Design a protein around this ligand. Structure first.
Ligand SMILES: [Mg+2]
Ligand SMILES: [Zn+2]
Lengths: 155, 157, 152, 287, 108
């Protein structure tokens, strides 16, 4: 029983200088004791891993699994808290920075499974996906490796 | 004016420095508003009662306020005092403040840094009528308001 | 192998299949709109169509009366079939029922479907319209309408 | 030396932009009421001369930003990036509303401006290209036209299909670059006190505001390019997906010069048209 | 039979997180262009359908209250009329199911 996640919304950074880039805000949120396995919640958690909040809600509204509505309620509460307390400007300017599912506590009869859901929303637009490794990049790195060979085992 | 209520003050306190009251009031005002910028709310516990301490401390957590006092426009003069009695004393004050609140990530969300600007106050101190000492208790026709840096939405009914 | 078998398999056998479809069809004739699992409605649509076809022949025919006796269970509906539904479609020669898909069922996440008899009194289903005729692509296609009509 | 003319335009453009933006007196607040069947009855509280309709759209949902293409405030079209100015009423116009009139007009004049920023730099520096105008044509017509005047040395040059292909590739580069259409309201004197290089648009510049009671005009900027148009433009150049300049025309009264006319046709990402329908549409972009 | 060896977390991760087992991102969601709610293309707007089913249920409750009991399927058409709506010239001889709220804008 460790309540660490909800304590990362309390780190008070130092007041920004007028020069440095505006720091993107954050909000951490968690749902505890979801009556649902973790090896099933993981798929929903990974689905919405790298997409903005509104697309995530859209994708969850139309998925069949039982945990979809739990994740949706969690994300809505997170968005409301982010606007109301964490001084976020636009409630659509958020994206799922981290989404994960973890084990839970309660007892057996045959384990009665439980799970927690952990979400970190980061202000700003989604980062673009890592592009595919173009053939020129592969040739460039192969040349780099060919050009770092030294005479092995001598002066 | 209200000498009938102030008779209780004279009887109980037995000191009643009437003209020193503005000085003490200004001192406690600047002190209380001075220690809102350090997370050192323990002394703010004894500088304000539980009536208006919980709001003055909870709605400021995770907000790096940096207040400041720069001048008093004119000397502060006492106002009418009324008075199973907690002694409430109201003091009018024209002061010169600067204020710059920040969010828990360090981004400005109210006021400018120096911007030394004037403020009008109807402050009200209260004190147990014993050991309990002076405590700020409360703070206008229609003075203007400085906007917020943030743009908001008000949903429909 | 199931090449060219048009009948679904449902219920506890052929007979239970006919009885399930019969209850669905009776509900449809009684209320004129029912929400049921998609596959069952798709199986029952053909039967509802042919029921209206039999009902057009009218009371006097005996074959149609026997058929509507079997396929309607609360007999108060047989009047309706022969005096409200079949008369209503004296013009249409086909397609008396519209079938849509709707949000999956909350409990068992089955594929649902609302099926109704065209022209009833009920509030209209939110049918999906096509794009307005004034949209960019439609406007360009309208220009092509004109320019092709004049040439021909 | 055109490569310095662009700088001579942009420097003063940014100068006026900055001097206008600096006029705002410490972030005043305005209230924007939202009307329309979707999410009705909301009250945005925006910044008097900083927040744009996008700043309102993003408040509602990513869907509004992705789908919105123009903004009505006080019931007149208003570009998405153009700052608001007073407590107003707002609504968002898309491509799929029942009456996408204003949106279609804005889309096509924006495509005209893009074709301008493509053609101008298309030629070899030793030639002299001068943009005449973006003649407003109805969407029903079949293509958007842009009137330019080439130098007299090219009278014996009707462009070949390969050069049109090059034009199209360059325009596709422009859309692929994904630059916005910044706007700027300016007093009409910029066109009469600096822009001496306006030789044929020297006529349009009085058409800007000589007709309207006020003495202010609209400037639109793709980025290291400037030109006027008669209405709002779509927010990003990425909106266009299918694009093609088909051919060119000439007007017979060849006394002033050869007023070449460039035809093009395009569609947004939303309203993509299948391959064969697109071929048919192109065939009619040659009239 | 039975396993001969435990299977490691690596093999289990190469099975459980294989793409074939992942949840696919749906490419067919959009916004009801007029109503402004989420929907799939080939399916009805859920909010609109619920607001239709509510009215259908209210109409049917009135129908039941008027027909009395079971086994009373009428032999004539039916028309439903909201407040301040006299039976039109086309609806005479058709059962009327009165309702006591203003006709919905979406009811044509
Ligand atoms: Mg079965
Ligand atoms: Zn809808």
């Amino acid at each position: 029983i460790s309540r660490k996640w909800e304590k990362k919304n309390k780190i008070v950074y130092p007041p920004q200088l007028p020069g440095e880039p505006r720091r993107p805000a954050e909000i951490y949120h968690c749902r505890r004791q979801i009556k649902y396995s973790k090896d099933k919640m993981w798929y929903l958690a990974k689905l919405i891993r790298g997409m903005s909040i509104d697309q995530a809600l859209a994708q969850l509204e139309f998925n069949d699994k039982k945990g979809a509505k739990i994740i949706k309620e969690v994300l809505l509460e997170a968005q409301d808290m982010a606007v109301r307390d964490h001084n976020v400007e636009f409630r659509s300017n958020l994206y799922i920075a981290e989404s994960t599912s973890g084990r839970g506590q309660c007892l057996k009869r045959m384990e009665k499974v439980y799970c927690h859901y952990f979400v970190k929303l980061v202000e700003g637009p989604p980062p673009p996906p890592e592009p595919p490794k173009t053939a020129v990049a592969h040739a460039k790195e192969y040349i780099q490796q060919l050009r770092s060979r030294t005479i092995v085992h001598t002066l | 004016a209200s000498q009938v209520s102030i008779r209780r003050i004279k009887d109980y306190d037995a000191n009643f420095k009437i003209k020193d009251f503005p000085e003490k009031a200004k001192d406690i005002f600047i002190e209380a508003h001075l220690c809102l910028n350090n997370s050192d709310h323990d002394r703010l516990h004894t500088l304000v009662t539980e009536h208006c301490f919980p709001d003055m401390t909870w709605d400021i957590k995770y907000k790096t306020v940096r207040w400041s006092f720069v001048e008093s426009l004119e000397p502060s003069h006492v106002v009418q005092v009324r008075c199973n009695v907690y002694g409430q004393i109201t003091v009018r004050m024209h002061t010169r403040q600067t204020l710059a609140i920040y969010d828990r990530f360090g981004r400005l969300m109210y006021g400018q840094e120096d911007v030394p600007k004037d403020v009008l106050e109807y402050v009200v101190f209260e004190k147990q009528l014993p050991y309990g000492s002076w405590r700020m208790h409360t703070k206008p026709w229609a003075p203007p308001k400085q906007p917020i840096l943030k743009t908001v939405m008000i949903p429909g009914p | 192998i199931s090449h060219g078998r048009v009948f679904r398999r449902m219920g506890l056998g052929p007979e239970s299949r006919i009885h399930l479809l019969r209850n669905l069809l009776t509900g449809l004739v009684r209320h004129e709109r029912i929400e049921a699992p998609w596959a069952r409605v798709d199986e029952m649509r053909g039967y509802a169509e042919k029921l209206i076809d039999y009902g057009k022949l009218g009371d006097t025919n005996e074959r149609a009366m026997r058929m509507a006796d079997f396929w309607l269970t609360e007999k108060d509906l047989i009047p309706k079939l022969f005096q409200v539904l079949a008369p209503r479609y004296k013009d249409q020669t086909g397609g008396y029922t519209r079938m849509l898909q709707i949000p999956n069922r909350s409990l068992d996440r089955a594929k649902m479907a609302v099926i109704e008899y065209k022209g009833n009194c009920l509030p209209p289903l939110p049918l999906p319209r096509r794009d307005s005729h004034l949209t960019l692509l439609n406007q360009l296609l309208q220009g092509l309408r004109q320019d092709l009509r004049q040439s021909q | 030396s055109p490569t310095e003319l662009t700088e001579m335009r942009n420097d003063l453009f940014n100068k006026e932009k900055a001097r206008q933006l600096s006029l705002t007196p410490r972030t005043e607040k305005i209230e924007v009421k939202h009307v329309g069947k979707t999410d009705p009855g909301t009250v945005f509280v925006m910044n008097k001369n900083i927040s744009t309709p996008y700043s309102c759209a993003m408040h509602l949902s990513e869907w509004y930003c992705r789908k919105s293409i123009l903004a009505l405030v006080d019931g007149q079209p208003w570009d998405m990036y153009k700052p608001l100015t007073k407590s107003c009423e707002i609504k968002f116009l898309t491509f799929k509303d029942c009456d996408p009139g204003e949106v279609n007009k804005a889309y096509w004049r924006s495509c005209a401006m893009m074709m301008g920023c493509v053609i101008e730099r298309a030629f070899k520096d030793e030639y002299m290209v001068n943009l005449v105008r973006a003649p407003e044509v109805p969407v029903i017509s079949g293509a958007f036209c842009y009137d330019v005047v080439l130098d007299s040395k090219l009278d014996e040059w009707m462009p070949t299909k390969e050069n049109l292909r090059s034009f199209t590739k360059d325009a596709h580069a422009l859309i692929y670059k994904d630059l916005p259409f910044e706007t700027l309201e300016v007093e009409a004197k910029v066109a009469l006190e600096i822009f001496q290089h306006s030789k044929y648009k020297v006529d349009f510049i009085e058409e800007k505001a000589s007709q309207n009671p006020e003495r202010i005009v609209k400037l639109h900027r793709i980025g290291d390019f400037i030109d006027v148009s008669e209405g709002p433009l779509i927010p990003r150049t990425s909106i266009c997906f299918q694009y093609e300049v088909s051919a060119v025309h000439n007007l017979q009264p060849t006394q002033p010069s050869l007023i070449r006319r460039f035809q093009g046709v395009s569609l947004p990402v939303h309203l993509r048209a299948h391959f064969t329908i697109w071929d048919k549409l192109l065939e009619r972009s040659r009239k | 039979a039975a396993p001969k060896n435990r299977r490691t977390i690596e093999v289990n991760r190469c099975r459980r997180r294989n793409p074939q087992k992942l949840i696919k991102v749906k490419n067919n969601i959009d916004v009801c262009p007029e109503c402004g709610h989420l929907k799939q293309k080939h399916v009805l707007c859920a909010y609109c359908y619920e607001k239709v089913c509510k009215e259908t249920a209210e109409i049917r409750r009135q129908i039941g209250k008027q027909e009395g009991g079971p086994f009373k399927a009428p032999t004539i058409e039916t028309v439903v009329l909201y407040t301040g709506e006299t039976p039109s010239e086309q609806d005479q001889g058709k059962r009327i199911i009165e309702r006591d709220r203003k006709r919905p804008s979406w009811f044509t």
